[PDB]
Amino acid sequence: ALLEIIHYPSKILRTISKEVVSFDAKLHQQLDDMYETMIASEGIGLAAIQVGLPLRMLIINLPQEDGVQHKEDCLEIINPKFIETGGSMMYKEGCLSVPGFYEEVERFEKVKIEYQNRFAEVKVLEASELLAVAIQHEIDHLNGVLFVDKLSILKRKKFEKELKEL
Ligand SMILES: O=C(/C=C/c1ccc(O)c(O)c1)NCCc1ccc(O)cc1
Ligand SMILES: [Co+2]
């Protein structure tokens, strides 16, 4: 089923999500509704609070060569934790909770994370480029952080302008 996506400046997006403790059928349906909702709004990443669920879980499905998304590659990360981070780069980002606005944000260019899949299985994942960015972006949601929060002083004004523009 489709879920309503929460948009800035909703204070719900400032929520600190909680660890998932029960990996049951209820949790799996939520993840399924999140995937259906993400694809429907044509997103590549989605965190639980973006649909009102204060749980520390998020999904990521980057499009491949053909430029299309294949559910086969969808990542479901729960209770993520950074093991290591390195480098720095500027990446223009977007967000389903902040539709119509895109801006460069500084991110680690490489990250290694630890999490669990929907079956509570522990996983370790190293990532760079787009995948590393999506991971950092989505995890920020779990801590109530939006990418517009990380904008430089100048690009911050650009947001307020384009915001009053809509
Ligand atoms: O999926 C999205 C955004 C979707 C979107 C769709 C329609 C719009 O009009 C819009 O403003 C945003 N973001 C996933 C997280 C993410 C952001 C930046 C990036 O480089 C990697 C990952
Ligand atoms: Co987002």
mmCIF file of C-alpha atoms and ligand atoms in Angstrom:
data_model
loop_
_atom_site.group_PDB
_atom_site.id
_atom_site.type_symbol
_atom_site.label_atom_id
_atom_site.label_comp_id
_atom_site.label_asym_id
_atom_site.label_seq_id
_atom_site.Cartn_x
_atom_site.Cartn_y
_atom_site.Cartn_z
ATOM 1 C CA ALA A 1 0.000 0.000 0.000
ATOM 2 C CA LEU A 2 1.050 3.590 -0.665
ATOM 3 C CA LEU A 3 2.067 5.689 2.327
ATOM 4 C CA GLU A 4 1.894 9.455 2.682
ATOM 5 C CA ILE A 5 5.298 11.079 2.412
ATOM 6 C CA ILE A 6 6.133 13.774 4.964
ATOM 7 C CA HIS A 7 7.446 17.062 3.578
ATOM 8 C CA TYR A 8 9.634 19.824 5.010
ATOM 9 C CA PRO A 9 9.147 21.780 7.259
ATOM 10 C CA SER A 10 7.190 19.135 9.175
ATOM 11 C CA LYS A 11 8.603 18.786 12.688
ATOM 12 C CA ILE A 12 8.099 15.013 12.306
ATOM 13 C CA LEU A 13 11.256 15.014 10.197
ATOM 14 C CA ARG A 14 13.256 16.161 13.238
ATOM 15 C CA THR A 15 12.398 12.985 15.108
ATOM 16 C CA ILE A 16 15.151 10.675 16.308
ATOM 17 C CA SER A 17 14.062 7.198 15.174
ATOM 18 C CA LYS A 18 14.371 4.150 17.435
ATOM 19 C CA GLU A 19 16.118 0.817 16.909
ATOM 20 C CA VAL A 20 14.116 -1.996 15.384
ATOM 21 C CA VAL A 21 13.867 -4.884 17.845
ATOM 22 C CA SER A 22 11.266 -7.179 16.271
ATOM 23 C CA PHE A 23 11.889 -8.308 12.710
ATOM 24 C CA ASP A 24 8.429 -9.700 11.993
ATOM 25 C CA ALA A 25 5.765 -9.689 9.271
ATOM 26 C CA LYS A 26 4.579 -6.262 10.443
ATOM 27 C CA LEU A 27 8.059 -4.861 9.847
ATOM 28 C CA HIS A 28 8.260 -6.541 6.429
ATOM 29 C CA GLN A 29 4.960 -5.033 5.270
ATOM 30 C CA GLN A 30 6.201 -1.596 6.351
ATOM 31 C CA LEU A 31 9.342 -2.096 4.270
ATOM 32 C CA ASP A 32 7.183 -3.213 1.344
ATOM 33 C CA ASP A 33 4.944 -0.163 1.677
ATOM 34 C CA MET A 34 8.081 1.978 1.792
ATOM 35 C CA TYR A 35 9.382 0.437 -1.448
ATOM 36 C CA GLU A 36 6.026 0.879 -3.191
ATOM 37 C CA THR A 37 5.868 4.465 -1.931
ATOM 38 C CA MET A 38 9.452 5.291 -2.956
ATOM 39 C CA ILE A 39 9.060 3.953 -6.492
ATOM 40 C CA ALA A 40 5.658 5.603 -6.888
ATOM 41 C CA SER A 41 7.234 9.002 -6.149
ATOM 42 C CA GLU A 42 10.292 8.032 -8.182
ATOM 43 C CA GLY A 43 12.889 8.127 -5.429
ATOM 44 C CA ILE A 44 16.096 6.145 -5.002
ATOM 45 C CA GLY A 45 16.183 6.371 -1.203
ATOM 46 C CA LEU A 46 13.641 6.500 1.634
ATOM 47 C CA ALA A 47 13.819 6.510 5.445
ATOM 48 C CA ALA A 48 11.037 5.419 7.803
ATOM 49 C CA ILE A 49 10.185 8.852 9.287
ATOM 50 C CA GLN A 50 9.594 10.103 5.755
ATOM 51 C CA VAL A 51 6.375 8.102 6.014
ATOM 52 C CA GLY A 52 5.866 8.743 9.718
ATOM 53 C CA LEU A 53 7.499 5.629 11.176
ATOM 54 C CA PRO A 54 10.105 6.637 13.797
ATOM 55 C CA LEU A 55 12.153 3.471 13.208
ATOM 56 C CA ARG A 56 15.847 3.272 12.336
ATOM 57 C CA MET A 57 15.494 1.628 8.945
ATOM 58 C CA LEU A 58 15.791 2.866 5.385
ATOM 59 C CA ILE A 59 15.804 1.526 1.837
ATOM 60 C CA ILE A 60 18.030 2.337 -1.119
ATOM 61 C CA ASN A 61 17.684 1.218 -4.721
ATOM 62 C CA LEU A 62 20.017 2.955 -7.146
ATOM 63 C CA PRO A 63 19.262 2.578 -10.871
ATOM 64 C CA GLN A 64 21.793 0.536 -12.830
ATOM 65 C CA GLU A 65 23.380 0.698 -16.292
ATOM 66 C CA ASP A 66 20.123 0.815 -18.268
ATOM 67 C CA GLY A 67 19.137 3.580 -15.874
ATOM 68 C CA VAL A 68 16.241 1.580 -14.456
ATOM 69 C CA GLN A 69 15.681 0.264 -10.929
ATOM 70 C CA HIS A 70 15.514 -3.475 -10.272
ATOM 71 C CA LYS A 71 14.015 -4.432 -6.913
ATOM 72 C CA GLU A 72 16.669 -7.157 -6.897
ATOM 73 C CA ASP A 73 19.249 -4.529 -5.922
ATOM 74 C CA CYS A 74 17.137 -2.797 -3.268
ATOM 75 C CA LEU A 75 19.006 -2.373 0.007
ATOM 76 C CA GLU A 76 17.053 -2.607 3.265
ATOM 77 C CA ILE A 77 19.246 -1.384 6.101
ATOM 78 C CA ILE A 78 18.051 -1.483 9.692
ATOM 79 C CA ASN A 79 19.816 -0.257 12.840
ATOM 80 C CA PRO A 80 22.769 1.037 10.777
ATOM 81 C CA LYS A 81 26.017 2.170 12.409
ATOM 82 C CA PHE A 82 29.155 3.643 10.811
ATOM 83 C CA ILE A 83 32.317 1.584 11.280
ATOM 84 C CA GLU A 84 34.491 3.964 9.291
ATOM 85 C CA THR A 85 34.307 7.082 7.132
ATOM 86 C CA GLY A 86 36.840 8.807 4.924
ATOM 87 C CA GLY A 87 37.456 11.468 2.321
ATOM 88 C CA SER A 88 35.191 14.352 1.399
ATOM 89 C CA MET A 89 33.265 15.410 -1.688
ATOM 90 C CA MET A 90 30.479 17.687 -2.875
ATOM 91 C CA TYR A 91 27.360 15.984 -4.201
ATOM 92 C CA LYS A 92 24.176 17.661 -5.390
ATOM 93 C CA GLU A 93 21.309 16.069 -3.503
ATOM 94 C CA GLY A 94 17.527 15.858 -3.606
ATOM 95 C CA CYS A 95 14.918 14.427 -1.219
ATOM 96 C CA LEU A 96 11.322 13.160 -1.441
ATOM 97 C CA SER A 97 10.646 15.189 1.703
ATOM 98 C CA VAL A 98 12.019 18.345 0.055
ATOM 99 C CA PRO A 99 10.628 18.071 -3.518
ATOM 100 C CA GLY A 100 11.830 20.509 -6.160
ATOM 101 C CA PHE A 101 15.037 21.536 -4.411
ATOM 102 C CA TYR A 102 18.511 20.233 -5.209
ATOM 103 C CA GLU A 103 21.821 21.415 -3.776
ATOM 104 C CA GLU A 104 25.410 20.285 -3.255
ATOM 105 C CA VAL A 105 26.209 18.824 0.156
ATOM 106 C CA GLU A 106 29.560 17.760 1.594
ATOM 107 C CA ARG A 107 29.797 14.019 2.219
ATOM 108 C CA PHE A 108 32.423 11.436 3.090
ATOM 109 C CA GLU A 109 33.429 9.895 -0.220
ATOM 110 C CA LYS A 110 33.723 6.441 1.351
ATOM 111 C CA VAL A 111 31.949 4.708 4.239
ATOM 112 C CA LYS A 112 31.728 1.300 5.858
ATOM 113 C CA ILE A 113 28.501 0.581 7.682
ATOM 114 C CA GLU A 114 27.097 -2.257 9.820
ATOM 115 C CA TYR A 115 23.379 -3.095 9.896
ATOM 116 C CA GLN A 116 20.770 -5.855 9.702
ATOM 117 C CA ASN A 117 18.503 -6.941 6.859
ATOM 118 C CA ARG A 118 14.784 -7.639 7.320
ATOM 119 C CA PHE A 119 15.614 -11.055 8.777
ATOM 120 C CA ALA A 120 17.838 -9.515 11.456
ATOM 121 C CA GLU A 121 20.959 -10.828 9.709
ATOM 122 C CA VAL A 122 24.050 -8.718 10.400
ATOM 123 C CA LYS A 123 25.710 -7.181 7.368
ATOM 124 C CA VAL A 124 28.783 -5.077 6.736
ATOM 125 C CA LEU A 125 28.856 -2.813 3.691
ATOM 126 C CA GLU A 126 31.513 -0.535 2.238
ATOM 127 C CA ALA A 127 30.421 2.120 -0.239
ATOM 128 C CA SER A 128 31.582 5.076 -2.302
ATOM 129 C CA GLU A 129 30.142 7.632 -4.719
ATOM 130 C CA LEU A 130 26.352 7.615 -5.127
ATOM 131 C CA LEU A 131 25.768 4.654 -2.797
ATOM 132 C CA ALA A 132 27.907 6.202 -0.045
ATOM 133 C CA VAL A 133 25.971 9.449 -0.420
ATOM 134 C CA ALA A 134 22.532 7.806 -0.249
ATOM 135 C CA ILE A 135 23.590 5.911 2.866
ATOM 136 C CA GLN A 136 24.785 9.093 4.592
ATOM 137 C CA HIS A 137 21.687 11.007 3.474
ATOM 138 C CA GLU A 138 19.232 8.336 4.613
ATOM 139 C CA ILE A 139 21.015 7.771 7.924
ATOM 140 C CA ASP A 140 20.792 11.523 8.561
ATOM 141 C CA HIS A 141 17.003 11.099 8.427
ATOM 142 C CA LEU A 142 17.206 8.588 11.284
ATOM 143 C CA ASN A 143 18.730 11.338 13.431
ATOM 144 C CA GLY A 144 16.270 14.003 12.309
ATOM 145 C CA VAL A 145 18.678 15.595 9.820
ATOM 146 C CA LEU A 146 17.722 16.945 6.375
ATOM 147 C CA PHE A 147 20.273 17.756 3.675
ATOM 148 C CA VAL A 148 19.150 21.396 3.680
ATOM 149 C CA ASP A 149 20.512 21.470 7.240
ATOM 150 C CA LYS A 150 24.027 20.968 5.879
ATOM 151 C CA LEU A 151 23.881 23.761 3.289
ATOM 152 C CA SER A 152 26.578 26.430 3.262
ATOM 153 C CA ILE A 153 25.679 29.978 4.277
ATOM 154 C CA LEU A 154 25.196 30.989 0.632
ATOM 155 C CA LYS A 155 23.345 27.921 -0.642
ATOM 156 C CA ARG A 156 21.186 28.242 2.469
ATOM 157 C CA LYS A 157 19.896 31.583 1.167
ATOM 158 C CA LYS A 158 19.295 29.991 -2.247
ATOM 159 C CA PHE A 159 16.972 27.495 -0.528
ATOM 160 C CA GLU A 160 14.970 30.191 1.247
ATOM 161 C CA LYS A 161 14.623 32.041 -2.073
ATOM 162 C CA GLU A 162 13.467 29.022 -4.068
ATOM 163 C CA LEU A 163 11.250 28.098 -1.117
ATOM 164 C CA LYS A 164 9.358 31.404 -1.079
ATOM 165 C CA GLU A 165 9.427 30.976 -4.851
ATOM 166 C CA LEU A 166 7.034 28.031 -4.623
HETATM 167 O O1 LIG B 1 15.117 9.613 -3.863
HETATM 168 C C1 LIG B 1 15.534 10.731 -3.551
HETATM 169 C C2 LIG B 1 14.867 11.942 -4.114
HETATM 170 C C3 LIG B 1 13.813 11.902 -4.966
HETATM 171 C C4 LIG B 1 13.074 13.099 -5.567
HETATM 172 C C5 LIG B 1 12.048 12.832 -6.527
HETATM 173 C C6 LIG B 1 11.311 13.892 -7.128
HETATM 174 C C7 LIG B 1 11.584 15.250 -6.781
HETATM 175 O O2 LIG B 1 10.862 16.309 -7.370
HETATM 176 C C8 LIG B 1 12.609 15.537 -5.820
HETATM 177 O O3 LIG B 1 12.877 16.866 -5.483
HETATM 178 C C9 LIG B 1 13.346 14.466 -5.220
HETATM 179 N N1 LIG B 1 16.531 10.930 -2.749
HETATM 180 C C10 LIG B 1 17.156 9.717 -2.214
HETATM 181 C C11 LIG B 1 18.322 10.135 -1.291
HETATM 182 C C12 LIG B 1 19.509 10.609 -2.139
HETATM 183 C C13 LIG B 1 19.697 11.998 -2.392
HETATM 184 C C14 LIG B 1 20.791 12.445 -3.179
HETATM 185 C C15 LIG B 1 21.711 11.506 -3.725
HETATM 186 O O4 LIG B 1 22.793 11.919 -4.503
HETATM 187 C C16 LIG B 1 21.526 10.119 -3.472
HETATM 188 C C17 LIG B 1 20.431 9.669 -2.684
HETATM 189 CO CO CO B 2 15.891 12.258 2.031
#
